Amino acid sequence: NIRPTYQTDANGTYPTNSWQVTGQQNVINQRGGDQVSGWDNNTIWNGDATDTTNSYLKFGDPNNPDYQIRKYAKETNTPGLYDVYLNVKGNKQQNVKPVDIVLVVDMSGSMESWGTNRAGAVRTGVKNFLTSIQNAGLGNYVNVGLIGFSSPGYIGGKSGYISVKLGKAGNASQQQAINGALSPRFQGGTYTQIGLRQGSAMLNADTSGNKKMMILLTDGVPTFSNEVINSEWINGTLYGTNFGSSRDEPGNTARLRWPYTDSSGHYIYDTWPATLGEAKIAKDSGNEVHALGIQLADDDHYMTKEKIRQNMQLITNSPDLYEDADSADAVEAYLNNQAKDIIKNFNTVTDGTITDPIGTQFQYANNQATVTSVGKQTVPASELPSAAIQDGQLTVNHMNLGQDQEVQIHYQVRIKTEDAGFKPDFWYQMNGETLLTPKAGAAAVDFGIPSGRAPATTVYVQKQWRQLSNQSLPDTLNVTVQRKVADGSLDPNWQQTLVLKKADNWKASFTAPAYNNQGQSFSYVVKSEDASGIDLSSFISSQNMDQQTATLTLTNQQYGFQFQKKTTDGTDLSADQLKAMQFNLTQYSDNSFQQASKTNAITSTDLQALAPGYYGIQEAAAPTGYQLDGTTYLFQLTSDGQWQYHGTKDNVTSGSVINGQQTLNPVGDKSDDFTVTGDHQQILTLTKYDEPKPSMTLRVIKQDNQSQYLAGAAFTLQPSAGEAETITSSATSEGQAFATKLVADGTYTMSETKAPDGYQSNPAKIAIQVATTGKEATVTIDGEALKPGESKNGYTLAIDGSTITLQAINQPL
Ligand SMILES: [Cl-]
Ligand SMILES: [Cl-]
Ligand SMILES: [Mg+2]
């Protein structure tokens, strides 16, 4: 009926009948209840640990339960860290067998000499003892009787004792009688034997099965006893076992004036064998004997108070059921503690235990389990249970709880979010089966187990591509996310694989616990080795975890090399000239630049992706019409993306950092350069200069039929590549040059466009193939060979080093 039940569903395992701590969402607790109405209706309250009314499971009478228990948890200000509280309230048992007490009070005169009101102490002690039991509501559970003793002739006439029959300590008339009987002035001898005998006889009258207890209050020296007939030695003390109706009556001392030998052949010289003997008969019959020695004094010259104490310790069932009282207050105190001991005997919780194993998904935050009284009636620290955490279990031992007594145990647990298989937004039980055993042999009852959970948080993973301008990206890239746990170590079991997509702006997300085993933010790291769409060798990766945006960014920075070709003479290079031109990029195994590992061609229009490594760049062939500078410039891309200049193959250096610009070897008037290029200094640009090869000039001299320099004849030069140019002849020996220089390998054709007014036109096509060296040239007139010094179709060829001279003779109309 109030055995807690749990649901298991997608949300985890939690109490079917639950309540929430006001303003907390990640703890859930078991509602209270009773055996009549079942579960209480109280589904949310503040969780204040000082509360002693809410969400208790109540056993027995709902209106006055035997015990009530409560287990609940509450989140602290540290995420994942929970306070757990166990409360147990006890009671006095009901409808169980009463206790039978006989007070046996030495009412001898001896007890009215220190100047101490011993009689007065006993009377108030006994009046209080009785009202204490009534005040505790055990009036009907405790039968009290009285045997007061003196000597025959002083109290009870010949008997030497008075009695009040057993009756309820709660009954007004029974209190009148016991207090009445003690009210007289104490007077007479000390017939301790008759007190014990008659106390025992009163406890043994009714065959009740009740607990039978006797409390002897005396100053300790019996002066009257029955004749010992038989006796035994037991543990070095003589005990009478059989008594005569005749009495030993020393009167003012234990010592007999006339010692005798009994029928057991033992020497009887004092009242102790009879007194101890009667105590033994009473205990052997089942009676519990408590005794108080009140201000014990030496017995005249016969026996020290120390030996008297040792004899009184043999009267009780064990020596610790004997106490001394030094004073009147100590008498009242002893009787008040005996009243407390009888009340405690009715506890619903008596050496109760709690077993509370921690839940799988939780660990103790520390090994402190703290114990506190919190009932209207204090549990003294000597009665508080002990609580210890050992090997995954909280244990509470020695719980003693009566009416209005309650204890609270406090401990703390943390949810383990780092365990493999941990689910966020999922209820985990903080405890295994949690049991109170109220007393030895009783059936255990179940505390309600609370559940905890850790919220999910979304973590974003962003790839920042910084590829070269000429680099295509794959559509997708596989990244693996890993985490550092609370200890700061890389979680070797946890990984999360993500597929980042071009379509999705390279951003994906995963779900995870918002906090680690210490309630702090997880530290994420991310790697890719996904080279299925792109070689990652040319990329240097950085990563950052921004906690504020919950974004792990992986930055892929690509590095490259390129070159630009220039001419010392300032001419632009044509598509056709760049075709002839060949640059090689060589990778080297190490910083000695000796063993080429790899080589590949590279063009002025390439931007080649480079991995960190050692490289060289060399012109293998110049652009058509330029000189080969075969210098090999040596450089390095370091692992951190720095550029270093390592000199030439002729002159290898240990490397200098390229800071923006590095000047290299001079080419004529200009200098080759390295520059660092790109928004992230990711490109090394070689500027390479080329010196031109020697060029050739074409001159025309015009003349008459009559050998006289003829002016205003227009000739045109047509490059096989480039614009036509037209010169008009001069009436001078020097003649006229074309402006167009005839560069190496170039193919040219010249013809007379306009003839001079008065002379006929010459339609001959003159072909000039300038050699690769740019120093010599082959000339054909009309597709036929024309050597220097010879003439054809009006033209004479003279070649003077780099100057070609065509002498054209003109014929009249
Ligand atoms: Cl013996
Ligand atoms: Cl960017
Ligand atoms: Mg006495």
Please characterize this protein's 3D structure.
It is rod-shaped and about 195 Å long. Strands 8, 9, 10, 22, 23 and 26 form a 6-stranded antiparallel sheet that branches. The N and C termini lie far apart (140 Å). The protein is mainly β and 813 residues long. The protein contains 7 helices and 59 strands. It has 5 domains: 6-91 and 350-452, Immunoglobulin-like, CATH 2.60.40.740; 99-344, von Willebrand factor, type A domain (Rossmann fold), CATH 3.40.50; 456-558, Immunoglobulin-like (Sandwich); 560-690, Immunoglobulin-like (Sandwich); 697-809, Immunoglobulin-like, CATH 2.60.40. One chloride ion binds at residues 232-233. The PDB classes it as cell adhesion. The entry lists the keywords pili, lectin, cell adhesion.
